């Protein structure tokens, strides 16, 4: 027997000894070793209600990544309003690793094994576990990177699809590779390569699905309508450098004669609007050599235009900024219960 409850979680990872990569270093002192023998217990004929938009695990993971980034990605200058601090900012080794979130004695994690689970409402195939799976804490905007994939169809996730102020998480069932490079020897100019055939096939399927939720209306994609570079661009961190990539070529409804390699223009930025809290961090110029990251696009962050009930269209724009939706997109099938 159990009841919905919150408690302090603990983390587990496969961190290595002597490795200087910051995620490894942080997991070495902040987490325990991964469960050598994990085994979930199935709860026969048990239906449970989940709410990925109201999940204290998300808040706790957010706390951890903030602590991780604050211990590892030390900006040269942090203009956090008023006075400014110019601490140490050596170049570091940055590559996220999987982190497990685990419950203490007296608690368990309920796991939604419904393959069409959209993140809210009842779950028919419930299992109990001691730790979540390994979740990579990938910080990004617009595109969710290096995550898990929907096991069946593309899933639409939203706290309330009818309210246009609620972010939509698109969970893909097929990943799309995005290959980003800053060639060696403008040191800040880069480019991301995406296969256009693939991207346009998935993007078409996303419109088909969104049609299902918006009574077969005309689905239109448009670039963000204003804001800072972090959300009008696809932002992410590659080898400790902050990439800002123009996704206009991705969120055009054009696709013809357009089906080759899509080349997104990118910049490595030194001055960043932080995602942890309102403030500005400045880092040193980028490192030498070929900077390259090959990542899987496993989801999209979408915001729907308002003032369209009286039209025949629904316009969708890439979103982002609140990193909790990134953790949400992986924590959606977990919930913490107390053993009564």
Ligand X SMILES: N=C(N)NCCN1CCN(C(=O)N2C[C@H](CO)C[C@H](C(=O)Nc3ccc(Cl)c(F)c3)C2)CC1
Instruction: Give residues in contact with ligand NAG (CB under 6 A).
Output: 40, 42, 95-96, 113, 115, 118, 120-122, 125, 127, 138, 145-146, 153-154, 156, 158, 160-163, 173-175, 179, 181, 193, 195, 197-198, 205, 209, 232-233, 236, 238, 246, 248, 293-296
d(CA 219, CA 211): 7
d(CA 92, CA 74): 9
Partner whose footprint covers residue 131, from ligand X, ligand NAG, none (CB < 5 to 8 Å by kind): none
226 binds ligand X (CB under 6 A): no
In this structure, the strands spanning 261-269 and 271-273 are unpaired
Going from the C-alpha of 118 to that of each of 168, 212, 329, 332, the distances in angstroms are: 11, 14, 10, 8
Partner whose footprint covers residue 175, from ligand NAG, ligand X, none (CB < 5 to 8 Å by kind): ligand NAG
Partner whose footprint covers residue 246, from ligand NAG, ligand X, none (CB < 5 to 8 Å by kind): ligand NAG
**Is the CB of 146 or the CB of 276 nearer to ligand X?**
276
34, 237, 295, 296: which one binds ligand X (CB under 6 A): 237
What is the distance in angstroms between the CA of the first residue and the CA of the last residue of the chain?
A: 6
Q: Which stretch binds ligand X (CB under 6 A): 105-113, 117-125, 138-146, 203-211?
A: 138-146
Q: Find the Cα–Cα–Cα–Cα dihedral 109, 112, 113, 116, rounded to 10°.
A: -160
d(CA 222, CA 218): 13
d(CA 255, CA 199): 10
Partner whose footprint covers residue 306, from ligand X, ligand NAG, none (CB < 5 to 8 Å by kind): none
Partner whose footprint covers residue 228, from ligand NAG, ligand X, none (CB < 5 to 8 Å by kind): ligand X
Partner whose footprint covers residue 278, from ligand NAG, ligand X, none (CB < 5 to 8 Å by kind): ligand X
**Is the CB of 220 or the CB of 229 nearer to ligand NAG?**
229
φ/ψ of 229, rounded to 5, equals -55, -30
96 three-state secondary structure:
coil
Binding residues among 59-88 for ligand X as defined by CB under 6 A:
none
Q: Which helix (H) or strand (E) holds 196?
A: helix 196-213
Q: How many CB atoms sit inside 10 A of residue 163's CB?
A: 10
Partner whose footprint covers residue 154, from ligand X, ligand NAG, none (CB < 5 to 8 Å by kind): ligand NAG
Binding residues among 242-271 for ligand X as defined by CB under 6 A:
242
d(CA 110, CA 133): 12
Q: What is the smallest separation between the CB atom of 255 and ligand X, expressed in angstroms?
A: 26
**Is the CB of 304 or the CB of 328 nearer to ligand X?**
328
φ/ψ of 212, rounded to 5, equals -65, -30
Partner whose footprint covers residue 189, from ligand X, ligand NAG, none (CB < 5 to 8 Å by kind): none
Binding flags for ligand X, 319-338, as an x/- string (CB under 6 A): --xx-x--------------
Q: What is the smallest separation between the CB atom of 18 and ligand NAG, expressed in angstroms?
A: 20
Q: Which residues of 311-340 are buried (b: 16+ CB within 10 A; e: fewer)?
A: eeebbbbbbbbebbbbbbbbbbbbbbbeee
d(CA 136, CA 27): 12
Which residues lie near ligand X (CB under 6 A)?
139-141, 228, 230-231, 235-237, 242, 272-278, 321-322, 324
């Amino acid at each position: 027997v159990w009841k919905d409850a919150d408690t302090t979680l603990f983390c587990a990872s496969d961190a290595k000894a002597y490795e200087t990569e910051v995620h490894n270093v942080w997991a070495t002192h902040a987490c325990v070793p991964t469960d050598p023998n994990p085994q979930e217990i199935h709860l026969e004929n048990v239906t449970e209600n989940f709410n990925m938009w109201k999940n204290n695990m998300v808040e706790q993971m957010h706390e951890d990544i903030i602590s991780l980034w604050d211990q590892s990605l030390q900006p040269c200058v942090k203009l956090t309003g008023g006075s400014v601090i110019k601490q140490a900012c050596p170049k570091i080794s940055f590559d996220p690793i999987p982190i497990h979130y685990c419950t203490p004695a007296g608690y368990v994690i309920l796991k939604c094994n419904d393959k069409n689970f959209n993140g809210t409402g009842p779950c028919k195939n419930v299992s109990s576990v001691q730790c979540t799976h390994g979740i990579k804490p990938v910080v990004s905007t617009q595109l969710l990177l290096n995550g898990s994939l929907a096991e069946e169809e593309i899933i639409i996730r939203s706290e309330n699809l009818t309210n246009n102020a609620k972010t939509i998480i698109v969970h893909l069932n097929k990943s799309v590779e995005i290959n980003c490079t800053r060639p060696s020897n403008d040191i800040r100019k880069a480019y991301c390569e995406i296969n256009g055939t693939k991207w346009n096939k998935v993007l078409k399927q996303v419109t088909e699905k969104l049609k299902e939720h918006f009574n077969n209306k005309t689905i239109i994609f448009q670039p963000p309508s204003g804001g800072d570079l972090e959300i009008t661009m696809h932002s992410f961190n590659c080898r400790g450098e902050f990439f800002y990539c123009n996704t206009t070529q991705l969120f055009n409804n054009t696709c013809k004669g357009c089906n080759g390699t899509i080349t997104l223009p990118c910049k490595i930025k030194q001055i960043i609007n932080m995602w942890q809290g309102t403030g500005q961090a400045m880092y040193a110029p980028p490192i030498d050599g070929k900077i390259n990251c090959v990542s899987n696009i496993t989801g999209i962050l979408l915001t729907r235009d308002g003032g369209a009930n009286n039209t025949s269209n629904e316009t969708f724009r890439p979103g982002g900024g609140d990193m909790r939706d990134n953790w949400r997109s992986e924590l959606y099938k977990y919930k913490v219960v107390q053993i009564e």
